[PDB]
Design a protein around this ligand. Structure first.
Ligand SMILES: NC(=O)c1ccc[n+]([C@@H]2O[C@H](COP(=O)([O-])OP(=O)(O)OC[C@H]3O[C@@H](n4cnc5c(N)ncnc54)[C@H](O)[C@@H]3O)[C@@H](O)[C@H]2O)c1
Ligand SMILES: NC(=O)c1ccc[n+]([C@@H]2O[C@H](COP(=O)([O-])OP(=O)(O)OC[C@H]3O[C@@H](n4cnc5c(N)ncnc54)[C@H](O)[C@@H]3O)[C@@H](O)[C@H]2O)c1
Ligand SMILES: [Ca+2]
Ligand SMILES: [Ca+2]
Ligand SMILES: [Cl-]
Ligand SMILES: [Cl-]
Lengths: 354, 354
């Protein structure tokens, strides 16, 4: 019963198997006449189906989305949008594709329709990212928040078995830290816990059958709730450290989240037992720790659990601990060198937390 | 997982004991320079405290709000606003005061800051009502949605023992029908169930001590969630029938919802077992039906459970049934005269549902 200020962003979310077939209707609803479809080179097939659904509303497909939105990709995409007379951007892909859409919207003001194909949750946050001279700069601007999100679990069926797990833990991370945010509120916490519950149940169902559209729906729904928590309350240690590892050492995004989460939770656990108890309840932990339970959820379904396995040099951990301590931020427990360095060593080695 | 389209209004909600002290900042935040405070003649003391907190931002207090927003109060209030040069209205009170505020916003476009003191939930719906030539017509329009809502449980301490119960059941009714709405969605249902849970626990706590600020927070929190469901999904038999009874027979509002809800639930129960299971879970029903449990929640806490106790004439029941069947609207179980008339007989006499 502590006071709070709740803010909800305007949102329009179209959800269900086959929903991507209504893409033209959603562009028309925005009053847009020339929508540019965005994707990575690996998702051109999906992008083409979207472009075909748009028919004469299509401004073409720009298939150069790239991880962490290099500022020169943002420029190139925006140039193409301008050249096509685009008045709308339709992002078909994961966090990186949404991110290119966000960059175009940042420079042009045009609406974005997001069609997410991972569990990253970027489609519902006002946070954008640009990588310049190797370092990712992020900011917040309502302008980058997609006007409409179309969640179609059919587009996640082919999400590979690995990323389906690791992106799912990335989403759980948003919710886990949301529960202990300095600006936590009951509504965000309600959605946080439900999001964790949905993903915790969906990971094994999807792992057993990646073509199960109900299991896929349950994960996408969880991803939406998690992303909503990310967009509404402040993150802390886990997200900051993942940014450090990803940005300073080029570690793959979802996998870094997956490996770090249990150790970031172990670090903060003593400080926020109420949030931990909610994470445990939502993950079916029983008497187990939140940390151990999330570790097992990753491990049991084939995700890597050691930074060693995703390209982190053991010899860079000392530097990683220094960078983790460089730019201060609020966290429930103080960020100190030694225990951060020990968190990093345990994450490196893939030690199951107690 | 069945498909849906979730739309959400931008929202700002300041919640907690003492939040009404922030009213001046909330008005400046909207860019307004002259807020007219609105209330019923019974709540002028609280309006004055608000007008004083507004200091130089105060355009004064209009103390003429009335049940079901008579069109003349509406026009008079607007005049006062207009002659004050007000660019903002602060509604301090229950649904009737929020209503006047909605009426002024409908006409002039000015922002409303809602400071609710009952559990009706109007503060978060786009529905407005006007009474003209003794008959109340409603409509919907985003323009009537308050830009900011300030929930201060200290302003509900003096909500009388009777209305505290009946208003709370009016709130529960919104969540209950929201759980079986044709356009039900998982987020609205998550809030619906949470709303019912808060109010089911809060009613007896408030009954035990009306000055208990935690009990009062719990109720107001529940009211907000239930109001949000009321504004996001379609209601059915319960709300339609209450509008008929209140409108055509001039029955007291909160009392009518309270009396009708168990019987509208009993009518629908067999069509929507899953929604009934969530209602039973949220109300601690155990093996009892939702209908019986909500009847008991009213009765145990001294609310009326028979329309006869609030002035309905038994000879008018046939006409109420006629009006209840006047136009076909969607409801999970088909609306048919014989079982509707029997529902009315049961509500009229206060027969506890099985
Ligand atoms: N701004 C924010 O609020 C926010 C939030 C979360 C993530 N992000 C950012 O998003 C990026 C991470 O995004 P991500 O983890 O979604 O991965 P990604 O967008 O970088 O996708 C990784 C690869 O998977 C492929 N892929 C994605 N969905 C697929 C599908 N369903 N079927 C087949 N292949 C598919 C993509 O084409 C890509 O090649 C990072 O840059 C991260 O920082 C930003
Ligand atoms: N538009 C919508 O979505 C919607 C939803 C619910 C109700 N309503 C409308 O609201 C009206 C009824 O609302 P209501 O049930 O809030 O009652 P009310 O607003 O009519 O209040 C009843 C009486 O109780 C007093 N009161 C209210 N709060 C008090 C407090 N905290 N302490 C002491 N006295 C207090 C009021 O001054 C008034 O005299 C109806 O006209 C109904 O249709 C509209
Ligand atoms: Ca070595
Ligand atoms: Ca060092
Ligand atoms: Cl724990
Ligand atoms: Cl039941």
């Amino acid at each position: 019963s502590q006071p709070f200020i709740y803010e909800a962003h305007a949102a329009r979310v179209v959800f269900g198997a086959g929903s991507s077939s209504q893409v033209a209707a959603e562009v028309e609803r925005l009053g847009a006449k020339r929508a540019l479809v965005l994707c990575t080179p690996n998702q051109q097939a999906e992008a083409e189906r979207i472009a075909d659904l748009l028919g004469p509303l299509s401004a073409g497909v720009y298939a150069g989305a790239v991880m962490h939105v290099p500022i020169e990709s943002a420029r190139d995409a925006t140039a193409r949008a301008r050249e096509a007379g685009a008045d709308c951007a339709v992002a078909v892909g994961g966090g990186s594709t949404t991110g290119l859409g966000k960059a175009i919207a940042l420079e042009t003001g045009m609406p974005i329709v997001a069609i997410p194909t991972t569990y990253a949750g970027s489609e519902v946050t006002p946070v954008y990212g640009l990588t310049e001279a190797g370092t990712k700069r992020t900011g917040r601007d309502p302008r980058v928040l997609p006007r409409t999100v179309i969640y179609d679990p059919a587009l996640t069926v082919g999400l590979p078995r690995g990323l389906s797990v690791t992106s799912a833990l990335n989403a759980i991370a948003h919710a886990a830290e949301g529960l202990y945010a300095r600006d936590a509120n009951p509504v965000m916490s309600l959605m946080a816990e439900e999001g964790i519950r949905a993903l915790a149940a969906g990971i094994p169902a999807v792992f057993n059958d990646p073509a199960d559209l109900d299991a896929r729906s349950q994960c996408l729904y969880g991803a939406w709730l998690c992303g909503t928590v990310l967009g509404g309350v402040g993150m802390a240690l886990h997200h900051k450290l993942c940014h450090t590892l990803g940005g300073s050492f080029n570690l793959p995004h979802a996998e870094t989240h997956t490996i770090v989460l249990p150790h970031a939770l172990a670090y903060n656990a003593a400080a926020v037992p109420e949030a931990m108890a909610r994470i445990r309840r939502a993950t079916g932990a029983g008497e187990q720790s939140a940390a151990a339970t999330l570790f097992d959820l990753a491990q049991r379904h084939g995700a890597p659990v050691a930074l060693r396995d995703i390209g982190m040099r053991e010899e860079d951990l000392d530097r990683a601990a220094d960078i983790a301590l460089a730019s201060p931020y609020w966290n429930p427990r103080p960020i100190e060198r030694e225990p951060i360095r020990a968190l990093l060593q345990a994450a490196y080695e893939g030690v199951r937390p107690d």
